[PDB]
C-alpha cells in the first residue's frame, strides 16, 4: 500500500524508505516536499530531477543504502535499469536510471526483471540480494555484482571503491570490491582487462602509492629524475603549464591537487555527472591561465606512468586507446623526435 | 502604511525593516524578490517557506534582530506565536511560527496579544520591550523572557546562549541569558529543573570544561581511566564503534567532533530543524560504517557523565527520562551484569 | 543560425558558446536547462536571472571569457550595454546589462553599435577586438578599454585586476590592466584621478604592501605607533570596537580579515552585487556585537592612511569626497579636539 | 537540423511544423512558449502535458494534421507508439503516446519502426504514407489503417468518423473511414465484430437514424410504443429519472442530448480523456437530481436497442459483454420478472 | 507613493487604479495576485505576460479605460510607447508596449514624454488629456489622436471603432472615431489614403451596408448576379470551397460568418495578437475541408469589391498592395484568361 504520506513517514522515522507502516502530513509546493512538525512545515526533499516532485521523492527515499557501484561504472557497462532498487546518482541529485522494476508505480516498467519488457534492457543485478544471481542467469541483458564466486561464471574484479550514500570509499566495515559479470543477448560477455579511476577529490586528495607521495612532496625536476620520466612531457601533461593565456596540459587529478595546495583555481564542471574522464573549464587564479575544455582523469600516477611509458613515440599524432573503468578511453598522443609533446584524454 | 515597496526600501537602506518611510521598485518572479539597482535586478530575498513570497519577505524583514531564545527552547516550551515580533527560524529559513500578532496584515490573527483569539495560544513575550511583562501577566497562555527579576514571579534561569541573527552565541556585548516564565490556562507554571544543550557545531567545536578538553586531547583508554568511566560504555556511546556495517553508538556531539578531526563523515540531516535531539543518517567515509538514524545530543560531557553515572544499572532495558531544554528526553538504557551496554536518546 | 540546441551543443562540447555547428537534445523545466546524456538528463544551467531561462542560458553561454573590467568599474563609468559581447555578472549570476548588441535575438536592441538606438547609451567597447576602437571614436556615448595606446586619446590607467570567468586576478599569463577611455554626447571625457579598490575576499585576504603585512602581524597599539596613526581613530574605524551592542567602526576589509583570523562573524550581504562600497549586516560570533548597515571598502591600507591623513580635522562633521573606482565616494568625517572620532563611507 | 527556434518559425509561418528552414526569437516562461512579434511577446503554446515545455511544443507542432483514428480506438487496439508521426490527444492536450519514432530527439526511441526496440511495441502505421503498408508487413506488432484494400489482408471496417485537428467528423472532402488491420507477434489478427461509438457532443447532437429522429421528436411514451420497447426500462436507462436525489439511469448520450434541449445540467468530466465509455458526475439544474458516477456511452440508438433486445432477461443481475470500438465493454444487466430494471456500462 | 497594496486597494474598491489612498493585504503565488477578503484569498489578477506578476498587475490596473485606438492601428502607425497611460492589449492579455512614461517605476523610461529618451520613440498622445496636443507639437516622433480639429494640422479620419475595456465598438454614448496625426523627426506627416478593417467577430457579425445584408441573405449565385461579380472568383475567395481536402479561399470575415450560421468550424488562432490580417488554421466540421494558413481580413464587402474591381486581370500572378489600417497589405492576385482565380492577403 504505497503512498506519499507513507514514504514521508518512513523518511521522518527511519531516515529512508524502510517498508514501515504509518503516515505523516505532507505538503507539496512547487518542487519541495514538506512535513508538518509541531505546527510548522519542515523540508524533507527538494526535487532537482526532471521527474514529478512526489515521484522523485519516492525514488530518493527508496535509494539503495548499501555500497553500490559508482554510476560511471554502471554507465560504462551499459546499465539501463536496476532490478528492484534505485541507484541514486548523487552527482546529478537524481535517479541513475529513468525507469524502475518493482520500486514505484509511476516509474515501473515491470514488477520483476523476468517480464519481457526487461529482456532488451541491461538490468543491474545485485548478488547480495536473494535470487538476483538466478535472475541474471535468466536475463537476456544484464550486469551482475557479487561479493564472491558464482559457480561457472568467470568474474571480473571491479574497483576497490564503491559509493555508500554518496560517499565513495574503500570499505573497511563493509565490502566495496565486487566481482562484475555482464550478459548481452543471452550471452555472458568477457569483461576486458582494465585500469580503474581512483575517484578522489581535489581538496581532500590522498596519495595511494610511494610514487604519488613523491609527486606531491618532491619538486618537479627531481621527481622526473627519480622516476626516469625525461622525454615524457610530465611538465606539461601532469604538472601543467600556466605561462601562456591557454593553460597547458594538466590532465591528471594528482597534478591539479598539487597545484591546489600552492595556488587556488576555478574548475567549472559544465557537464555535472559521474564520468571516467571529466571536462572542466579551468581558470588559474594566480596567473590568469585558462582552458575552456580541460579533460581530467584520476588515475593512480603509477598506472598513468605505465600507460605513457608503454607507448610507441615514433609518430607525430595518434589515438591511443586505454580500457579504464571497463570503457575504451581515447587519448591523443603527440610526439616529436622520439619524445612526448602531449598526451591527453581526447576531446570528442 | 505597509507595502512591499516600503519593506524593500527598508531592507535596501537599513538592512532590515526599520519603520522608515520610502519605496524602491520591486519585481517578484516565482519565489524571489528583486529590486532595480542602476538598471539591473538585484536579488533581495529567496522564499524557502510555504508562505507566499511577498508575505515571507515581509516576515523575514521584520525578524527580531536582538538575541532571542533558540527555536528548540521556544518549541520545548510550547510557544505557538510571538507578541509583536517575528522569531526567524534560520535552520528552516522560515518564520518559527505560522501566525503573527501586530506584524503583517497577511499573517496577523490579532494586532495586540490581549485580543481573545490569542487567549488559547502560548504567546511569546519579551520583557525587554515596554509593556510585555504586563501583557504576559494578563495573557491566559504565554512564555516570557526577561533580563532581570519580575516582582513576585519565580524565575527559571535559561541557557547561557541565545540566537542573534542566526548566530548562536554566549553574549559578551549583549545579554543572551534570560529568565524564563510560563503560564498555562491563566496559571503560572513552575518550569522544571533542566540541563541545557550546548548548541555547538561539528566543524567549529570548542570544549567548555576541563573534562571536554581531556576528551579531545587524551586517547580513549586514558580518558576513561582518568574519569573513572569503566563499565559506562563510553567506547560505544561517546567514541563510536566503526568496526561493523552498522555504526555503533556515537550519540554525543563531542564524540562526533573528535572523530571529525581524524576522519571525515557525512551527516544527513533528514529533518532539518532546530531540536534538542538531532537525528542523522551518518556514513563514516574512512570505514563505510553507517546508521540510518543516529540520535545526537550536544550535552556538556560533564552533564552527560553526571546523567549516566546517576543511573541504576541493574535492569536489562529501561527508559530513563531527563529534562533537557525544558523538555522530557527519553533515553534507552541497556545494561548487562551491572555495566552499561548502551545509552541513547530513544528513537520515537 | 542561432538555436537553443546549438547553444547547448557548444556548452557541452566547447565549455561555452564557440560558434560551432551542431545540436544536442535539450529539455527546459521551470528555470533549468538539461541535456540528455546516455539516456539521462544532465543539468547545464540554472536560471538565477529575471530573463526567460532559454534567453539567460544563451547570454551566459555567450559570456566574455577574456579578462574583463569588474562590473563595479563598468557601473561607476555609466556603462549601459556592451558592443557584441556579454559581460557576465558573477556576483548576481546574471548579465551585467539588460540589453545586447549583436549577441542574442531576444535581447538585442541592434546588431551593430553604430545603429541610432545605441547613440544615447554608453556602449562598452573592447580594443582587443578588431574595429572596436573605431566604433568608440564613432559612438556618441561609450567606454573603451585597450591594452595599449590609442593615437591622440588621453588614457586613464585602470586597476591592475580584472575578472576572468568570475575570478578577479592580477594577470601574469594575460593582461588585466587596461587603459580606460569615456565619451559623453560625442565628447571624450577626462576620467578623474582615482584610487582603486583591491577586490579581495575576507577568507583568502593577502596583504599587498609592507604596511598591510605590519597591520596583520603587529598588535593594534604597536602598528598605530609605528605608522604614526595616533588621533586617527584606527582602533574604531579599522580594528573595530566589539565592546557595545552596536559594533563600532570596522569599515576597511583588512580590519575584517584580521578579526576573521581570531574570531568568526556573519556578514549578511543584503544587496548582493558588485560595488565599490559594500554594505553588510554584521554579527560578531564571539561577542554578539552587531551592526545592521556596516559599510566596508577594500582599499590598500596605505591609500586609506593617505586619505585620512590628508583631512582637515578642525570641524565636528563633514562630507569628504574621494574618487574610488572612477566614482565619487562620500565619507563622513567626525572630529573632536583636532582628532578623528570616526571616518566611514557615508550610508546614503 | 532540429531546433526550438526552427519549430517556432514553422508554427508562426506554416501553422504547424512543415520542415521549413528559418528561425524566430523564442522565450520560455514557466510552461509557455512565446515569440517576439514587432517588439512584443506573443504566446505560441501553453504546455498542459507532463513533458518539458519545449519538448511538448515540438510534439504538438509535429502533430498529424490529416484525419486520424480517435485516440479511444488506438487505445482499444493496444497502440503504444506511432510510426513517424505524433497523434495529438486533444481531449488531454497532450501526445497520445509517451514515445516517438523519427519525430523528436528528446522522445524518440528509434528513427525507423524497423529498429529492434519497436518490434515488441504495437506500432501505428498509416497506409496513406508511402511505405507504411510495407512496414506493417514486416512489423512484429502493429495496427494499420488504409483508405482501400491491401492485397492478402482481409479488412476490418472502422468507424465512419475520424479526428481532424481535434474535430471529430465524418469526412465529405476527406476520407475518415479506414480499414483496420492488426498483427500480434507477426500474425495478422482477425479483428472482432464490433459496434462503434458515434462520438457526438451534447450541445450539437445530430440524429443518425429514423429511430434517433423519432427519439428526439416524440414524447417518451409514444416512442416506446412505436418501437415496442415496453419492459426494456428505456424510461430509466435512456430518458433518465430525475424524481429522486440520486439521478436514475441516463446512460445513452442521445438521452442526455434530449434532456439538454429542455433543462440544462452539469457534467463533471472527472477523468478527462478519450474513452468508449465516459464517466460523469452529473447534477441536473432543474431538479437537483445528481449522480457521482454516471457512465455514458454514445451508441446509435438502434445499436443500443439491438444489444438490449439480444439479452436473456431471466436473471436478477449479470455481466453482459459487448464489443464496442474493438474493446470488450462490460454492462450490468438487472432484471425482475422477465423485464429490464437497468442496463448500464459497468463501473469497475 | 506607489505600492502593490495600494494598487490592489484601488482594484478592489474602484475597479482599476484610480489614484485613491489605501491598502489591502495581498499575497503573490506564482503568477497570481490574491487579496484577503474576510479571512479567505480572492484572486485579483492572473499574469499572462512575460513581465513580473506584480509589475503586470500594476500596468493592468493602470490601463486606459477610455475608448482607445485598437492595438493593430497603433502598431501599423509605428507606436513604441504611450504618454502617461497604458494601452492594454486584450488580445494578448498584456501591455501593448514594453515600456511606459510616467506610469510604473519598474517599466518607466521617463516620467514625461519631453525627456530626451522619448525623442527617438514614436510616442502616442491623446488630445482628450490636457496638454497632450501641445506635447505632440514639441515631440520629435509621435502619433496624436483627437476628437476634433487641431489648428494648423490637417487630420486623417481614423476608423469609426475603438476599443473600450477590450470591447471594440462604434461609440454612441462616447466618441470612438478619432483624427489621427503623425510626425516623424519633427515633421508632420501626410498620412496615406486607407481602407479600415471592420473589427467584427464571427459569432456576432452584423452587416454594415446593403451589399453585406444582401451577401448574408441571398444565395451565392443571385448575389454574384445582382452585384455583377461574375469572373471575380467570389465563389472561391469569399464563399469558400469546401469540396477538396484543402479548403479553398475563404479570406473575408463576412464569408466565414455566413458559413458559421449553417455549419460550425474550428479557427485555430496560432499567433494570438491584434493584426489587420489574421492567420487561422481552419477545419470545417461538416466536410473535413481544412487549411493550415488561412489569411482572413475583415473588410466591408463594398471595400473588398472596390479593391478587386480596381485591379488589372491580365497577368498570371502578381502582388497587389493595398493601404489598410495605415499599413501596406500585400495581396496575391492570381488570374487566368482575364478572370480572377484567387486573391488573398499574401502569406509572407
Ligand atoms: N507472413 C505473415 C504476415 C503477412 C503480413 C502481410 C501484411 C500486409 C500484406 C500482406 C501480408 N503480415 O504478416
Ligand atoms: N514646426 C513643425 C511642427 C509643427 C507641429 C504642430 C503640431 C500641432 C499643431 C500645430 C503644429 N508639429 O511639428
From Swiss-Prot, chains A, B, C, D, E:
Segment of the intact protein contained: 6453 to 6798 of 7096
Site for Uracil recognition site, residues: 295
Domain called NendoU: residue spans: 206-345
Domain Nsp15 N-terminal oligomerization: 3-63
Primary role: Plays a role in viral transcription/replication and prevents the simultaneous activation of host cell dsRNA sensors, such as MDA5/IFIH1, OAS, and PKR. Acts by degrading the 5'-polyuridines generated during replication of the poly(A) region of viral genomic and subgenomic RNAs. Catalyzes a two-step reaction in which a 2'3'-cyclic phosphate (2'3'-cP) is first generated by 2'-O transesterification, which is then hydrolyzed to a 3'-phosphate (3'-P). If not degraded, poly(U) RNA would hybridize with poly(A) RNA tails and activate host dsRNA sensors.
Annotated positions binding uracil: 291-295, 342-346
Lineage, highest ranks first: Viruses, Riboviria, Orthornavirae, Pisuviricota, Pisoniviricetes
Compartments where located: Host cytoplasm, Host perinuclear region
Cofactor(s) annotated in UniProt: Mn(2+)
Record: active site: 236 (proton donor), 251 (proton acceptor), 291 (for uridylate-specific endoribonuclease nsp15 activity)
Site, Transition state stabilizer: residue positions: 291
Signal peptide: none
Binding note for cofactor: Likely affects Nsp15 binding to RNA.
Residue ranges of coiled coil: none
Domain AV-Nsp11N/CoV-Nsp15M: 64-189
Reaction(s) this enzyme catalyzes, per UniProt: uridylyl-uridylyl-ribonucleotide-RNA = a 3'-end uridylyl-2',3'-cyclophospho-uridine-RNA + a 5'-end dephospho-ribonucleoside-RNA
Record note on quaternary structure: Homohexamer.
Domain of life: Viruses
Protein name: Uridylate-specific endoribonuclease nsp15
Amino acid at each position: 500500500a504505497m503512498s506519499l504520506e507513507n514514504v514521508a513517514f518512513n523518511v521522518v522515522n527511519k531516515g529512508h524508505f524502510d517498508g514501515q507502516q504509518g503516515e505523516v502530513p505532507v505538503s507539496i509546493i512547487n518542487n519541495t516536499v514538506y512535513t508538518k512538525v509541531d505546527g510548522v512545515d519542515v523540508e524533507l526533499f527538494e526535487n532537482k530531477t526532471t521527474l514529478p516532485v512526489n515521484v522523485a521523492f519516492e525514488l530518493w527515499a527508496k535509494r539503495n543504502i548499501k555500497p553500490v557501484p559508482e554510476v560511471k561504472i554502471l554507465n560504462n557497462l551499459g546499465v539501463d535499469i536496476a532490478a528492484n532498487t534505485v541507484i541514486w546518482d548523487y552527482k546529478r541529485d537524481a535517479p541513475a536510471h529513468i525507469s524502475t522494476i518493482g520500486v514505484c508505480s509511476m516509474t515501473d516498467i515491470a514488477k520483476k526483471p523476468t517480464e519481457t519488457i526487461c529482456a532488451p534492457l541491461t538490468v543491474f543485478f545485485d548478488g547480495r540480494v536473494d535470487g538476483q544471481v538466478d535472475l541474471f542467469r535468466n536475463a537476456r541483458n544484464g550486469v551482475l555484482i557479487t561479493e564472491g564466486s558464482v559457480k561457472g561464471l568467470q568474474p571480473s574484479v571491479g574497483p576497490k571503491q564503491a559509493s555508500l550514500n554518496g560517499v565513495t570509499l574503500i570499505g573497511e566495515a563493509v565490502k566495496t570490491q565486487f566481482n562484475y559479470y555482464k550478459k548481452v543477448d543471452g550471452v555472458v560477455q568477457q569483461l576486458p582487462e582494465t585500469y580503474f579511476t581512483q575517484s578522489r577529490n581535489l581538496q581532500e586528495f590522498k596519495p595511494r602509492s610511494q610514487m604519488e607521495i613523491d609527486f606531491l612532496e618532491l619538486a618537479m625536476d627531481e621527481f622526473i629524475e627519480r622516476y626516469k620520466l625525461e622525454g615524457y612531457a610530465f611538465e606539461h601533461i601532469v604538472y601543467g603549464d600556466f605561462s601562456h593565456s591557454q593553460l597547458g596540459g594538466l590532465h591528471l587529478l594528482i597534478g591539479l591537487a598539487k597545484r591546489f595546495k600552492e595556488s587556488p583555481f576555478e574548475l567549472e564542471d559544465f557537464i555535472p555527472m559521474d564520468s571516467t574522464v571529466k571536462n572542466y573549464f579551468i581558470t588559474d587564479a594566480q596567473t590568469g591561465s585558462s582552458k575552456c575544455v580541460c579533460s581530467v582523469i584520476d588515475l593512480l600516477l603509477d598506472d598513468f606512468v605505465e600507460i605513457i611509458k608503454s607507448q610507441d613515440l615514433s609518430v607525430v599524432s595518434k589515438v591511443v586507446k586505454v580500457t579504464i573503468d571497463y570503457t575504451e578511453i581515447s587519448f591523443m598522443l603527440w610526439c616529436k623526435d622520439g619524445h612526448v609533446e602531449t598526451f591527453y584524454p581526447k576531446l570528442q
